[PDB]
Amino acid sequence: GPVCPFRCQCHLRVVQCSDLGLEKVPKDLPPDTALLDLQNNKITEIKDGDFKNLKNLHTLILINNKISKISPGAFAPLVKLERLYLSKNQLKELPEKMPKTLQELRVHENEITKVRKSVFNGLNQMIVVELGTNPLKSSGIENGAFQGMKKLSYIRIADTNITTIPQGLPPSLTELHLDGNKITKVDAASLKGLNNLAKLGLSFNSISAVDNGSLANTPHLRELHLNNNKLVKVPGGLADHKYIQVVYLHNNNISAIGSNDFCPPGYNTKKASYSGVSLFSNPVQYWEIQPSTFRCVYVRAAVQL
Amino acid sequence: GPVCPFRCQCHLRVVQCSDLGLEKVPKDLPPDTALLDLQNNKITEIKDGDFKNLKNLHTLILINNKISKISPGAFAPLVKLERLYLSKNQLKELPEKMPKTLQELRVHENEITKVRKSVFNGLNQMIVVELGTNPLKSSGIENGAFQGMKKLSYIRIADTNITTIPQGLPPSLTELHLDGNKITKVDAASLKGLNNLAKLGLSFNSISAVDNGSLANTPHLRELHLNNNKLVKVPGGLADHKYIQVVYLHNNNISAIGSNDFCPPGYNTKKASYSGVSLFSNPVQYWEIQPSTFRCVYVRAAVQL
Ligand SMILES: *[C@@H]1O[C@H](CO)[C@@H](O)[C@H](O)[C@H]1NC(C)=O
Ligand SMILES: *[C@@H]1O[C@H](CO)[C@@H](O)[C@H](O)[C@H]1NC(C)=O
Ligand SMILES: *[C@@H]1O[C@H](CO)[C@@H](O)[C@H](O)[C@H]1NC(C)=O
Ligand SMILES: *[C@@H]1O[C@H](CO)[C@@H](O)[C@H](O)[C@H]1NC(C)=O
Ligand SMILES: *[C@@H]1O[C@H](CO)[C@@H](O)[C@H](O)[C@H]1NC(C)=O
Ligand SMILES: *[C@@H]1O[C@H](CO)[C@@H](O)[C@H](O)[C@H]1NC(C)=O
Numbered sequence: 001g002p003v004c005p006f007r008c009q010c011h012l013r014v015v016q017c018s019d020l021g022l023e024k025v026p027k028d029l030p031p032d033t034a035l036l037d038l039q040n041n042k043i044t045e046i047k048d049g050d051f052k053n054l055k056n057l058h059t060l061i062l063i064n065n066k067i068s069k070i071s072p073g074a075f076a077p078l079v080k081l082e083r084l085y086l087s088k089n090q091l092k093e094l095p096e097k098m099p100k101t102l103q104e105l106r107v108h109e110n111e112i113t114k115v116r117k118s119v120f121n122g123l124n125q126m127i128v129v130e131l132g133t134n135p136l137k138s139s140g141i142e143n144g145a146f147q148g149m150k151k152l153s154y155i156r157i158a159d160t161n162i163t164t165i166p167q168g169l170p171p172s173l174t175e176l177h178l179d180g181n182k183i184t185k186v187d188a189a190s191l192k193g194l195n196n197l198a199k200l201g202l203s204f205n206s207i208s209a210v211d212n213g214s215l216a217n218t219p220h221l222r223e224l225h226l227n228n229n230k231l232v233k234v235p236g237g238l239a240d241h242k243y244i245q246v247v248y249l250h251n252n253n254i255s256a257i258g259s260n261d262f263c264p265p266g267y268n269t270k271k272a273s274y275s276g277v278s279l280f281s282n283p284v285q286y287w288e289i290q291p292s293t294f295r296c297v298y299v300r301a302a303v304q305l
Numbered sequence: 306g307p308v309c310p311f312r313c314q315c316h317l318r319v320v321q322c323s324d325l326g327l328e329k330v331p332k333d334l335p336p337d338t339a340l341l342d343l344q345n346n347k348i349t350e351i352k353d354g355d356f357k358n359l360k361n362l363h364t365l366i367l368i369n370n371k372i373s374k375i376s377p378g379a380f381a382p383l384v385k386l387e388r389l390y391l392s393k394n395q396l397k398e399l400p401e402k403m404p405k406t407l408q409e410l411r412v413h414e415n416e417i418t419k420v421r422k423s424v425f426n427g428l429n430q431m432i433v434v435e436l437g438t439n440p441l442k443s444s445g446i447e448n449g450a451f452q453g454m455k456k457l458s459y460i461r462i463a464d465t466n467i468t469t470i471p472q473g474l475p476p477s478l479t480e481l482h483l484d485g486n487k488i489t490k491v492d493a494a495s496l497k498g499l500n501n502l503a504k505l506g507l508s509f510n511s512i513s514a515v516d517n518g519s520l521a522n523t524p525h526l527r528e529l530h531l532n533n534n535k536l537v538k539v540p541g542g543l544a545d546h547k548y549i550q551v552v553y554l555h556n557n558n559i560s561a562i563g564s565n566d567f568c569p570p571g572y573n574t575k576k577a578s579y580s581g582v583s584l585f586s587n588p589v590q591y592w593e594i595q596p597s598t599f600r601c602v603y604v605r606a607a608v609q610l
């Protein structure tokens with residue numbers, strides 16, 4: 001029969017092996033295991049036999065190991081796998097042939113420099129991907145790499161070397177989080193087809209420009225965080241956009257605000273009302289903003305100067 | 306209504322906020338939240354209002370933050386809390402007035418130097434405690450500190466400064482893991498009353514002696530790991546013990562093995578059969594062990610010299 005490794009706790013389909021200095025994945029675990037916690041050990045690779053007879057496993061936590069190598073399909077026997085947590089390891093690339101049931105993949109704080117389309121092909125249950133804190137550059141992401149994920153709703157690539165928004169992002173996305181990178185411009189083509197995008201996080205980059213037409217490509221966008229960048233003007237298209245409600249622009253280089261930067265000239269009843277606009281920590285001062293500029297805002301607390 | 310903090314994912318009673326550099330616990334989370342994941346942020350303290358209206362919370366993950374301070378009872382509003390994970394933080398002591406529903410407490414890799422009985426009083430649902438990787442000394446553990454936990458089944462104190470087995474341990478214990486400390490002796494009094502103890506992990510200490518009578522105080526002990534210590538002889542009492550099956554003694558200073566070190570002189574049918582005995586990496590050599598010494602072992606693979 002199955003064995004609980006010495007010091008681990010195996011109770012009610014949970015195998016708890018965190019904090020033990022283990023050097024490889026334990027074998028002979030109970031076949032009905034639903035959650036496997038191997039956080040904070042010293043595992044250095046995942047080999048082909050590591051995950052056999054764990055056909056009920058829905059969660060695998062490998063956070064904070066020393067993994068620098070994963071055999072292709074090492075995870076494929078995990079036919080019910082939904083969550084794969086690989087953060088705080090030493091991966092250079094994403095694992096190939098992950099189980100098609102996968103819903104969430106976390107690879108925060110690795111050494112990832114290449115993101116291949118192939119890793120993601122057929123991963124049609126994937127809803128969330130977290131890839132931040134990696135030395136990754138824009139050249140390292142194949143165009144349309146994330147396109148094979150037809151239900152993908154959330155992606156975050158944060159605190160990396162990327163300099164442009166990835167092209168060919170899946171149109172199912174509702175959240176795109178690209179905070180703390182080295183992005184210098186928002187181009188319209190990267191946002192093309194993102195008609196379900198609700199949130200766009202571009203905070204803490206070096207953005208100096210938003211292409212005209214950019215935001216019209218995210219017609220249902222509701223929240224736009226562009227604080228802590230190098231903007232010299234408010235992004236074009238806010239007045240004509242019908243869904244935008246939250247626009248953070250604090251800590252930028254904006255020296256003037258024109259009268260139709262936020263509001264169209266005539267009250268447009270089809271345009272959603274602003275709930276939050278931040279403009280503080282910019283060269284423009286409250287006394288340089290024409291009163292009319294926020295005529296379409298009716299909650300006075302919404303605008304923060 | 307409730308708010309999902311920007312970049313977090315709130316889905317099906319799970320609030321996923323890992324890897325965001327957050328500096329405090331988010332407020333206004335959905336009231337039905339069952340699991341809250343705040344792993345890998347920059348939270349520096351838990352204040353009194355932090356956990357209100359989270360009455361369905363069963364799991365709280367605060368692993369890998371910078372927490373150096375927790376107000377007494379900050380966690381008490383968490384009336385359904387079962388798992389509290391506080392590993393990889395900067396705590397100096399354990400939180401006071403934890404919820405009485407608590408089943409598992411993990412505080413691996415903190416700066417804990419004092420363990421008070423008071424923290425554990427009334428925690429009668431507690432089954433597992435992990436306290437390893439802490440600068441903790443034996444003087445820092447009040448006598449009988451763990452005694453208030455009447456269902457406690459597992460405790461691990463590993464990779465600390467402790468030099469003796471804690472006294473007044475709860476008699477419900479089935480596992481005691483004290484690997485990698487600075488323990489120098491096994492005294493019988495520390496083991497007194499541990500009649501449910503099945504596993505005893507004392508590996509990687511500086512143990513030079515096991516008091517006679519020690520193991521008789523754990524009458525139902527099945528596994529005893531004493532490898533990587535400074536033993537000069539096999540621990541007394543193994544021949545008379547009726548339950549011991551696994552005895553690891555590799556990497557010690559054992560220079561001789563007497564004929565009744567493991568087996569009683571006459572076959573004792575009430576004594577459980579050895580399944581594993583390790584003796585390699587000791588001064589005694591295979592050619593110095595009288596054949597009869599393992600007469601009560603019938604699986605020849607059991608004994609490793
Ligand atoms: C950007 O890439 C270089 C290697 O080309 C790396 O050394 C640097 O730390 C990266 N930035 C980060 C911290 O991701
Ligand atoms: C963007 O659009 C605005 C308003 O129509 C215009 O003033 C500006 O010159 C345009 N920029 C470019 C480079 O096309
Ligand atoms: C801000 O914009 C001005 C001109 O509009 C320019 O002189 C400057 O280089 C920009 N950046 C900073 C950080 O001041
Ligand atoms: C033992 O305690 C001292 C402080 O008295 C500490 O500096 C040392 O690192 C401790 N051992 C460990 C690593 O727990
Ligand atoms: C422990 O017991 C053994 C066997 O009865 C005996 O040889 C030994 O001297 C005892 N040690 C002490 C210090 O009582
Ligand atoms: C081992 O025991 C012997 C005497 O039996 C002693 O000389 C020595 O100090 C002990 N320790 C080591 C590490 O050899």
